[PDB]
């Protein structure tokens, strides 16, 4: 056994016990030593003012999550694209964790909820952690940057009521047509896993990888689930909500502590920049993706995921990925999402966690060291501050190493611009109404779903929604009509 | 109309437009205007950076939560119990703030979650904020200050799952005795109130008042709903949980809104410090009530909730109680409890909030203001910091004028304690047996919901929660066993 | 009279009281009523807890300084090179707040510390907050934004020690070149300022000014003190030093509460894109100036201070200025030392004053309102959070107002590249030119070399070498001075 | 690997420690074109530097900003367990790491080694019973002993709230008002105000502390630490010009003698008082103005200690170090002294916002010898210990045994408010001080001189008050003083 103390190694006797001046006793039929509570009781002080500050707070956005440690294996050669390290050898093996969430609930809320689901993996590689931060989709809501804190904040709750706001929802949804593909796949029954398991991940985004001889490739990345791509109708996740809102936190752990580990497949797509010119769409428009006929998958690894984290807390909870965080061999694309990206992640840990974040264990670099000597002191500094290193580079007396050293071209003006509409945009959404109704049930659940959500907006919104669904097909605003109203016969 | 700006006012011409150098676009079919985005965009990274520190801490417990303005009216005079300004003569009025909440449960979760429920008030009086911090149940799970966090952290998540741990849940309680008053509430079908305007208000502890002579008397504080005591029972709690987690707050906004105005009428029972020298229990044990039959209720005033307010992050999240905030004629008594709270909700709300949280609009003392010259400087100083005024008392430059009988008696030395059990714990546990199956159902409904909840304990624990219940009347063990067993039949 | 109260508004019987129950008193010649202190006494811990909690972080840089409250006028009309706002039309009048500083010493450190001096001044117009942040000099000792931390570090306080270290220090510097000019004006007199009142400012960076037709041009602003500029010798600063380590601070505060206000009258430089063109110079090189014979200086106004904060910590501290607080008719350059700051200083305010330090009344947008619905919540937030308005663009319940909306501007070609400034030969000409701009006054060039000579007699001699090299770099005499000097200053121990 | 690589703070190697990146601005017509265009937020170079630059500081401390620090080990050297049940005292010649820290009072982060001021004296013990903070200052009394008072005083000792200056109105003004001050004011204006070094000063415990034998007697105590260095003064014009030329001649002083090996010690006395002799006093054993005289209670040696070592990184250690007189081991408990009892609150509560929640984390700060195990205290901000994995956090949790370590004044009254009372025997010490100077020539007249320079600079009304004030203890002082200001005056 251990010995129970303060947070400063003092042992302690009682665990139960504070101290006081008790009343006198004299008439009481009853008397227990009660009396004012002292400031001395260091006990009582250090375990209140601690249980004080317990919280922090939750992510902005995918605060509700749960994780887990597991493998990654490079299984085929494709230095020919990528020249990083982690990908080096056929068979190397590589730490990591990966943390799955819904995106607007907050952290109390339904694992069940209608959402995207994220996926976010932390590799620690030789050269430093890589962050990739997806998502089970491989598409998105947006394509302007500056678009997403309207967006969100349409998604959650109304500034006045705190309620969930169905008008604001489509508002926003409507007015901003490239939105339609992601809403598709959204009420969709895909809006609703099973469990983190049973999706994909998608990188979303287009980045580009580089092989050791400079020679560099647009790519785009999918994580497939050897569990299959298994999804919830409506009324299930609905129910599951009640009965259990912590359903897949709890399914992953299991899993898990059973040896049923999951594990995913790994491809990529790639593309030269010369393919990238003659396309429809861009590159860079994260509404949009390759066609599978046009752009083959191509496998080089897979990851398992093994082992539960020892504190949910600790590790899980004060985990921080970031697209930024990358090694050499990979760089990000011009996506200006992406782009944005580059900075939020990095900005919001300084504010969730604390400007040393990194210090924290999981968001160490654990495989490399790393020695960056201009970046000291701070907040909450544990990790020795270097001790005496100088803190400038080329110090007279510190010697450091430094590792060694066609692409875009740019012309014109500095721009402001915010994406504008073409023809194509609807184009990609057509597709997705044909790829479901391949399957029965998807066509008419997207209907029904659509229209739960829509029926408690006023009938002006609704009318806007038949239009903007009906972009994509004309039977669709149609059919979610035709649903409202048999909704509102009955009452 | 509104002019759109940044946060420092200078106006914007386009809310969505990012600055970026654009990409060569010879050779390409299309060819937006993409590139990387810049340092400069000024109105990008303000108001990225700004989403990105959106979020502050939940309250470590009663996260979730809805809030009010309402009127408080003094209807009877009491001033020869109580000195306050606020209750001086008859009709007089004071605006007051009230925050609904339940306990275990983050900010996600359900309104309609079995818990105890919060009632925090506060009053803006001639002489500073009273805040009368209050639960829906007139007795609580502890009687001992230093057990809470054990206690809350055995009703939330474990800490290596971040599941709910049915497991840790019954072993605290069971282990502590002194629970089963207020575990029997919470099993109660009042563990499950239909709304916030349909539950009761409780000061739970003892409080002295004083009269202008200096005459004080032991008080309990009772506000009851003129809406009546409405509950839910287990099924359709769980139900709503999944349809709408924020019902109550749905139904206190909508009510406010139609003109449906809830009210409470206040009640006090007093008590003098002879007789409570002659009672089987202590005025200081929070697990204990004060039989009506004994000390009768005395009106003295009302309350009706009347405004919703204009911002809920701004007013109903940020808003900060504290027992230790009350005004002339009403000091806390020695409950250890209540003694302990006196310290940690301002310690918790420097955490929460900031160190000058009194300075956000809801937490001024509105209706009397402030001169507190010693307090100054400290993070986010906004009201001024009293300009040029000295910061120490009697400075030759600075005049300032201050506030113009037998009390408790103590002896013996500092003692640590422990409150130990006797007998007439479990008295009072078998009186509320009773008060239930005066009305049908409700005695069974206690076992089924026990049972419920208990059935995912192992057995070994299962156990001890019999023998627990049945601490009250043998009976009730004997028949959550039977309900156990006839639920693991089915499965 | 008001009446003492806790910070939540009930009223103080005593001051100094604090709560115990006493010890018996029985068998003492001396029983004062002492005993343990209690949880319960609100007005003890609610006073310490306050007390406990003081204290914000300085700031990284110009953590020392002093502030005032002043006016500014436009007195020519230069609307033909700028539109905004503020200059709008002859006569008209601007509330502004100005914070001198000096650079790298902490909070308590003197104000006659050799060093440049910050000079910052928030305009409240009415189309937002305009910050001008400027220093004491013209140039800097730098051009490459990253090399700032690094550059500051060796300015400050050795890791391990905690003191000055004058190896670091020069080190530093003469292993970057382009540092020459301005340590030139450093160890010159004009690193010892005599007063605030005393002392120019200058924009240092070339910013883009456009009128309203769309037109612009590249600008340098200048602030000249109306009270001239007086420096003070060596000796002298640091006698001060350790007399009045406020001496600035004071002076400043009483010359403006006795109506001796200090002013200062504006001018700007002005240069097309095709002037830009046949210059020997970048205008985006902060280690440079432009030459007063090839373009002149254009009057344009005149700022007074004449108001003394009503509390230092409320005001002067809490202040924050940002170069990218700017309004319509003024943007940055692409200087990437200014282009770095246009970061930093909302990034570094975040963390000394907070996510909401926007709110703190020095820092609103006084003149202006602000009507930002996409910026809520945080920590704080005492400004209302705009009640109920709606928190994304185009609401459909949310009617709102956008400002009305083209000419030839600078053109970009290439890929995206890494670079670090490399020198010419023409780095090293304007310090030589620097060199004998002083020496037309007397007794400046010797101060300069008794200057550098004082502070680098106590670096190691392999160190003391390199900083020979490098002055001599200027001109060649300023080593063999320097050498000289410091060589007769050994001989005493 | 050496020599280090180096990285950003997520480990990825970097090229060139300099360089920014940018899209370059078309150079056709320039004479002289450098690549220079708009810097790009993709650069994570960039940003991941400047933006923890931008967050290198911390509050400093609120008092003793100023300070140097150095690790040291202190010996045990006689046998003290009849008054002492302490661990780290055990047995003779056990030796136990330490870390202390010294500083000038009001000074701020950059002001002056020799500025007139009391000198504090922290040190930390790490022992197996937890970590002992001796938190002491350079005299055995102080000028308060109301705690409330602390911010009055310290105020006037700072900065005018206005102007920024410091005000020597102010200064006195409180002084004056405040006769029990006038002990400490003597010392302060003596010459030793002003040491020569940290290496030639003493420490005092000031307060009086209790100390616990193994049987549980207790006795009052007065520890003094001597420096073996001699104690060593400055006259005012050299403290003055010093001020000047090396502001952290004390700091330099230190480390250089460390690093020299010339290392400084103190020898460890303590002065013990039962109850029963406290009880024949003409003063409290409560009172931090009041000296125990050397006849009557002599110093019983029985230890010593020596600082041996200097810090890695200031920063890190010195800096970030923690001190609070509540960090205690079993054996030393603290006294009534209200000033001490309001410390024992003070020190951890501004602990917490100087550095944040979980300081005790920090390495300096940790319990190193014994470990620590609190499984109650979780979370909460830059929870980098792991935060103990799995292990529940709650008292008597079936499924995890804990071990408990097992193990006077009486109290008469009701609540009392007090603020000491004056009485005649409060000027009679520093009667005998007076008469302890002028033992030694130039002392008296230091004072005098010294008294006098600061008074100078105040308004008449308020030198007047000062001469009445010095000669409340003799009435020549009061003339002395009155003299040599008007010498001052006429140079
Ligand atoms: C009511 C009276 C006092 C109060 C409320 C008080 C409070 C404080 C506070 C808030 C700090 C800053 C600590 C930190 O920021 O980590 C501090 C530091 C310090 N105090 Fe006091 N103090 C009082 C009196 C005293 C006395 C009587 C002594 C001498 C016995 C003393 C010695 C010190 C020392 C040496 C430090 C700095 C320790 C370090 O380097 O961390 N103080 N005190």
């Given at each position: ?373 201009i970046n000291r002191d701070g907040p909450m500094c544990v990790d020795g501050n270097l001790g005496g290193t100088p803190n400038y580079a080329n110090a007279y007396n510190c010697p450091i190493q430094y590792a ?78 035709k649903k409202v109203q048999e909704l509102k016969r009955k009452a």
């Amino acid at each position: 056994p251990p010995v129970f103390t303060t947070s400063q190694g003092c042992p302690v006797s009682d665990p139960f016990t504070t101290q006081r001046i008790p009343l006198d006793s004299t008439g009481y039929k009853y008397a227990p030593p009660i009396g004012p509570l002292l400031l001395q009781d260091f006990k009582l002080i250090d375990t209140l003012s601690h249980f004080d500050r317990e919280r922090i707070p939750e992510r902005v956005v995918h605060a509700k999550g749960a994780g887990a440690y597991g493998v990654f294996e490079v299984t085929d050669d494709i230095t020919d694209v990528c020249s990083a390290k982690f990908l080096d050898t056929v068979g190397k093996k590589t730490r990591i964790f990966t943390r799955f969430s819904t995106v607007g609930g907050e952290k109390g809320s339904a694992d069940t909820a209608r959402d995207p689901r994220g996926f976010a993996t932390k590799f620690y590689t030789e050269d430093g952690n890589l962050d990739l931060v997806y998502n089970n989709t491989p598409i998105f809501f947006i394509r302007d940057p500056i678009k997403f804190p309207h967006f969100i904040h349409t998604q959650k709750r109304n500034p006045a009521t705190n309620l969930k706001d169905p008008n604001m929802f489509w508002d926003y949804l409507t007015a901003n047509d490239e939105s339609l593909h992601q809403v598709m796949y959204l009420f969709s029954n895909r809006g609703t896993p099973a469990s983190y398991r049973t999706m994909n991940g998608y990188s979303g985004h287009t980045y580009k990888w580089y092989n050791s001889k400079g020679e560099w490739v647009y790519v785009q990345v999918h994580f497939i689930a050897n569990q299959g791509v298994h999804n919830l109708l409506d009324e299930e996740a609905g129910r599951l909500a009640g009965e259990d809102p912590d359903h897949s936190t709890r399914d992953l752990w299991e899993a898990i502590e059973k040896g049923d580990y999951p594990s995913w497949e790994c491809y990529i797509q790639t593309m030269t920049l010369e393919q990238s010119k003659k396309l429809p769409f861009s590159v860079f428009d994260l509404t949009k993706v390759w066609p599978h006929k046009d752009f083959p998958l191509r496998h080089f690894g897979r990851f398992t995921l093994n082992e539960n984290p020892k504190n949910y807390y600790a590790e899980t909870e004060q985990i921080a990925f970031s697209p930024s965080h990358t090694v050499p061999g990979m760089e990000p694309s011009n996506d200006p999402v992406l782009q944005s990206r580059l900075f939020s992640y990095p900005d919001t840990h300084r504010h969730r966690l604390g400007p040393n974040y990194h210090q924290i264990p999981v968001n160490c670099p654990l495989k490399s060291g790393s020695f960056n000597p201009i970046n000291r002191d701070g907040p909450m500094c544990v990790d020795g501050n270097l001790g005496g290193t100088p803190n400038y580079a080329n110090a007279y007396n510190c010697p450091i190493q430094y590792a060694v050293s066609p692409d875009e071209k740019y012309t014109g003006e500095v721009v402001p611009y915010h994406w504008e509409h073409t023809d194509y945009d609807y184009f990609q959404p057509k597709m997705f109404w044909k790829v479901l109704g391949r399957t029965p049930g998807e066509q008419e659940s997207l209907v029904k779903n659509v229209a739960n959500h829509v029926s408690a907006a006023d009938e002006f919104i609704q009318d806007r929604v038949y239009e903007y669904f009906s972009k994509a097909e004309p039977i669709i605003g149609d059919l979610i009509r035709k649903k409202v109203q048999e909704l509102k016969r009955k009452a």
